[PDB]
């Protein structure tokens, strides 16, 4: 039994966009949750199926660690039952989620004075995403009256729009990295227990 890649996920030099969020499956390692608080000045640490201090006691089989960046005023949207542009078109948690949502400010790392348009979010979609569904399609949205034929002509808009983080001023619009830890029952021989 070795250590978990928790320290290699929260301190990534490049974070995934909300429409291309990674899912690092964690198995066969001892979960040392003491390293989480060292690099996560959490703005919201609401756990919905576990306790933050009892993580070193319970044990799970497989742990999934999502990673995505969203707007500052959209941190509350990453929660079971929430709505919004992110909670409905980019990342939606189920009503029976069992884990914790970790989010911290990253204005000193994920922001540039010339505009960091490398992070994009989806604006519109014909239907909401299923729980834990990844949306990779970049096809031009159609207005319905006429097809766009792959070009963004009249009444044809691109589905991906950048955030454009501005480090000058403004609260609620700063870049915030979000990591979501998912725990499944999975009644099978466990592999990732606490450091006991």
């Amino acid at each position, epitope marked *: 039994t070795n250590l978990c*890649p928790f320290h290699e996920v929260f301190n990534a030099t490049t974070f995934a966009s909300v429409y291309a969020w990674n899912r*690092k499956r964690i198995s066969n390692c001892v979960a040392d949750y003491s390293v989480i608080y060292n690099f996560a000045p959490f703005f919201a640490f609401k756990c919905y199926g576990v306790s933050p201090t009892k993580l070193n006691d319970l044990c799970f089989t497989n742990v999934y660690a999502d990673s995505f960046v969203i707007r500052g005023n959209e941190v509350s949207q990453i929660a079971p039952g929430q709505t919004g542009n992110i909670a409905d078109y980019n990342y939606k948690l189920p009503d029976d989620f069992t884990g914790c949502v970790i989010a911290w400010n990253s204005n000193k790392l994920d922001s540039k004075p010339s505009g960091n348009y490398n992070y994009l979010y989806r604006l519109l979609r014909k239907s909401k995403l299923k729980p834990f569904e990844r949306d990779i*399609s970049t096809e031009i949205y159609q207005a319905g009256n006429k097809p766009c034929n*792959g070009v963004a002509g009249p009444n044809c808009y691109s589905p991906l729009q950048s955030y454009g983080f501005r480090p000058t001023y403004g609260v609620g619009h700063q870049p915030y990295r979000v990591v979501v830890l998912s725990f499944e029952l999975l009644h099978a021989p466990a592999t990732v227990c606490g450091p006991k």
Partner: antibody
Amino acid sequence: QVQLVESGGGVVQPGRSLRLSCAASGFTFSTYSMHWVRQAPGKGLEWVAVISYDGSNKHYADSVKGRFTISRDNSQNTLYLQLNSLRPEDTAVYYCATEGSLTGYYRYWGQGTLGTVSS
Amino acid sequence: SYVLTQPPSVSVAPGKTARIPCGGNNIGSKNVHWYQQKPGQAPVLVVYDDSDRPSGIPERFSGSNSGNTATLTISRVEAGDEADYYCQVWDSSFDPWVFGGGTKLTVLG
């Protein structure tokens, strides 16, 4: 058992179209997301396209954007791939793969089809 | 896009342990999947989430994910394991499934 058979291509002139197909059996074809991976003779694996479980989400590579179109037919469990506007650098062995989970691993493969762009 | 680095060719003696790495920038934050492609056939999955193997793969295959480079530990490599191996990772780019440059594992017969 899990079976994937890709229909053979053939010799085609540049600018033409090649019609491929991938018959799958042994697993639930309407649940897993099907992909396409091509391999040129003497070259490594390169991703081509991804089709959603229902055909809504579609994505392609930058080197094959615009001309290639991916499609699936769940009524008969046959994966299709229209190779429109062929180019000399498109000569590759197209493999019919299947995505396992959200982490992005392939568990099911076929045998590959031969598509040669000759002049 | 992401750039997976593989060695051009790795030679291993029969019965020994062969190790094919796969480097990358911050590769630890993502899963590395391996495939075994024998000349004349299609690739076959061996280790997907850096630790587990599907049904039909012997226990001699193993992997790890730590630091800035992956590791595919294959022990007791017989003469019948001469094939090419490839990596696969999911990146924060425009999402092309980045495959490695390929590594031909040859057994000194």
